[PDB]
Design a protein around this nucleic acid. Sequence first.
DNA 1: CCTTTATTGACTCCATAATTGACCAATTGAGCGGCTCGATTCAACTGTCAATAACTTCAAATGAAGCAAGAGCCTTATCGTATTCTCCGCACGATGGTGCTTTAATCCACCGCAACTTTCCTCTTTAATAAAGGCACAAGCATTA
DNA 2: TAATGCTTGTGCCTTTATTAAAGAGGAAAGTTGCGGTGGATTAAAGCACCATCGTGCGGAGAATACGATAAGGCTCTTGCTTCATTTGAAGTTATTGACAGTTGAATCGAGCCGCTCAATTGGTCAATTATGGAGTCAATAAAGG
Lengths: 93, 93, 80, 80, 96, 96, 104, 104
Amino acid sequence: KNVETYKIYIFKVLKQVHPDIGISSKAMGIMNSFINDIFEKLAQESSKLARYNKKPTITSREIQTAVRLVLPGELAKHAVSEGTKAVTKFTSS
Amino acid sequence: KNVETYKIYIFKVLKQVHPDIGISSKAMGIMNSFINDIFEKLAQESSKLARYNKKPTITSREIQTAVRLVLPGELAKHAVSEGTKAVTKFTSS
Amino acid sequence: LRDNIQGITKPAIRRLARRGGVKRISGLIYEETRGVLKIFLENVIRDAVTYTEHARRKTVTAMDVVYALKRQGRTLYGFG
Amino acid sequence: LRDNIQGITKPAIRRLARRGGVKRISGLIYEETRGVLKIFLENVIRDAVTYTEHARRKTVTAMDVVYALKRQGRTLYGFG
Amino acid sequence: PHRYRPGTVALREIRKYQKSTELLIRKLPFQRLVREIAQDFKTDLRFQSHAVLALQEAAEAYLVGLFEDTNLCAIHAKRVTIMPKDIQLARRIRGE
Amino acid sequence: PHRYRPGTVALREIRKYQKSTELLIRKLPFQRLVREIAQDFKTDLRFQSHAVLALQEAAEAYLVGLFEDTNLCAIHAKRVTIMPKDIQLARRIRGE
Amino acid sequence: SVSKSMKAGLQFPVGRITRFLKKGRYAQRLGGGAPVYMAAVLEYLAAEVLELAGNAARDNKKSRIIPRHLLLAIRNDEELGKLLSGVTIAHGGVLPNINSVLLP
Amino acid sequence: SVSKSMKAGLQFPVGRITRFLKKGRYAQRLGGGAPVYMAAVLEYLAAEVLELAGNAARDNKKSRIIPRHLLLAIRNDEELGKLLSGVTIAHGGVLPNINSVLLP
DNA sequence: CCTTTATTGACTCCATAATTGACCAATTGAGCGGCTCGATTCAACTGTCAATAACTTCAAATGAAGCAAGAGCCTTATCGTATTCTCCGCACGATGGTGCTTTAATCCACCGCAACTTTCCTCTTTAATAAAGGCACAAGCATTA
DNA sequence: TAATGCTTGTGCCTTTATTAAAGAGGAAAGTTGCGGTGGATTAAAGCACCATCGTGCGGAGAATACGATAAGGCTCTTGCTTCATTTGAAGTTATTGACAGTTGAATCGAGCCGCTCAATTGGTCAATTATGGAGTCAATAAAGG
């Protein structure tokens, strides 16, 4: 059975930030677990936000509010800025 | 809009335990919040249990395991005993 | 609004310490206790306001405060 | 199995204290540190076993331990 | 004149305030403080009264628990007077 | 003869063990301890090896954090020697 | 028509709990006995807390349960105190305790 | 066929994240831009952690990121340390710190 | 121990408001049928965990000796406490105004469903070079003089 | 300061194993079309939150006399550290076997979906009884003698 992991995409991101630095298998597993954990946190917060407001759908606004609730401070600011940029790029195309 | 609470059923339970003792409105709200919080905890634990085992349904077994995970010690033992009694009574009828 | 943190008077902090079982209180506690309190509120109100901003409302309800508290492991019964 | 709690030897506890930044260690620490450790394990293994009992399995996996730890606010990366 | 020794009326106050369930902070100054703090997150905010009451009760519970921890830390150092370092140690161990 | 004063080799060990990432508890005694503890919850249990490794790493992380808190408590009472009361106070403030 | 709560011998609303479980979308499907188990557990917990609170109220020579009695019942019990350790009861106060060092 | 990640200018799998969001049943319906927003946020967090870890690895004169470098990057950063305060990194060790009192 | 004084709890009378009881509707739980999926059982394959034996050598146990750190005792001086006077702004009651929250209708717009395509991401296999093991070695440090 | 043991940091050979690179396929993402359900807009009631004014009185602020508590200094004695020797138990390697986890199929049970409807529960209003406000007395405890 093929297992879904971010080990591909994470590696891509690494080659965009540090082209000459590799990553070990243990560190790759730790990074994959980190991505999974943050995904679950954001998704659960978005679900709670949708349920509190009696909304059946999760939009980018729910994700933005979940990012503000979960990530601290400047991390949340930069993440919101990147998410808004990506959504604008996706919609404009 | 009609607001839905447990304030009826809890009162019934009180009259079964302490027939001569009443309950105030503030204590009524506190008990209702307590019941809602425990319901949410057990339901979320059951959902996590079903998701972990790739099961689409929540059975009384998921609820029993969630009770064991959430309630501590003798509380969990007695709650499991009560739930098993209720399920047996419901099925036998 | 300014200086409102000074509205948490020394007798109020002393009463809160008495409820905590404190028999003797140093002179500089009242300052520290204020700052600590401020931090706590800034952690809750922010979250509460966030909820108020998501519901597209302008009034902060008791539900917003209860959810903001529950988000931090400070569940509060009696306002649900 | 009995007496296996004594397998957590005094040098092991001393190394754990050194990694924690401890310079001097009292004589009775090694006993207390054992009991504390035992309690911790009993809180995790139980939960882990519970998961193993729900999946109708007889073998405790790393997933069971990871979930049992996450249930207690002790999230552990590297075994996911 | 009748003078109580230090720490006697303090013990009486400990017994009196641990038995009551009332709020210990004045309501209007706390309301002003909450509005001041919230004005830095979103200007022109309105507060439902029960929201401010919930905030006050949560803050008072937090401070009472913190003072219990502070008293434990003070007694650890062979003292009866709580000091700012005790609050700092309690908040550090608590994870704050 | 050449002898180090007390607390020097202790500081060197602090620097050495804070730099390494290895496990500090022996694997086989810990495995026996885990099997002993689990035998009281369900007889005839089997343990996957990575499960025991995860348990060991979690337990070691917990003990190291507890010892950091214990060292803070010991420093608070104007001492350098950690004592059982320090562990008890740290676990009390931590909520255990 | 025999209500499910009466069929299970409970006072709590098995049907309403079924609706709450389905509305929350905790799983795609819901078993027949899951709401019954839910109702039984909730009823037992409510009965336990109310027993302790009523005993506390009787000890105080009061015939009505107030949040103070609920807090006393919760904090004077090991299991309930462990379950509700991180919970604040409104208008509940604190457990009366003074450290032995502070006493004269 | 232009992939949604290429459309949004991301390296992360917008489609796979959409599948994960739908499979997790977090809501009845999923908006068009919610997976894109989530992918952007996850990509940014991964980039931040990897930048800090690569800097830590370079400071140690190593060309490979190991769990020790990830832990050093996490603990030496205020906001990442706040986000991952209750997280244990396997084979990560601890941040080297000795109290001033213990020093000679 | 005694004696005086301040505090607090019990006891009762009166107000009071707060919980209990009763009624109308509203809305939702129970019933019944059809149907598709899922979870139960069975079986085989196959992965791996418990157990064995052997050998080694490194870390644990134990003791000696040493030293310095915790704990008890004493002294002091300063600083939190109990009390009183005075002052001041919190709180309760009544009232106006307005803005903003909720509800309902309407329209449009966008997302789930279903099937086809096509492409990219994941086991399996092979290579190669970064780093641990080991050896040699320099130097910053601690220790006693 | 200074000589000297000493441990840790630094430089180089080795190898290896742990990561970089590549392929077949198959599982999953992108596309297209439809249609219905949900979000966005607008208007209106009413209600709820802000601001005003008055007052009067209980709580806050400031000063005073002071005692007792925290902090520093001293001493000592014992408990923990450092080091050396002996051993005994963990660690690694190779092997066995049997248990149990996983995958694949059939199938019978069971829960979703629609629609009716009637039985249960919630909003609204009157009301009495447990509880608070206030006054008075009796018991308890603290502080000086």
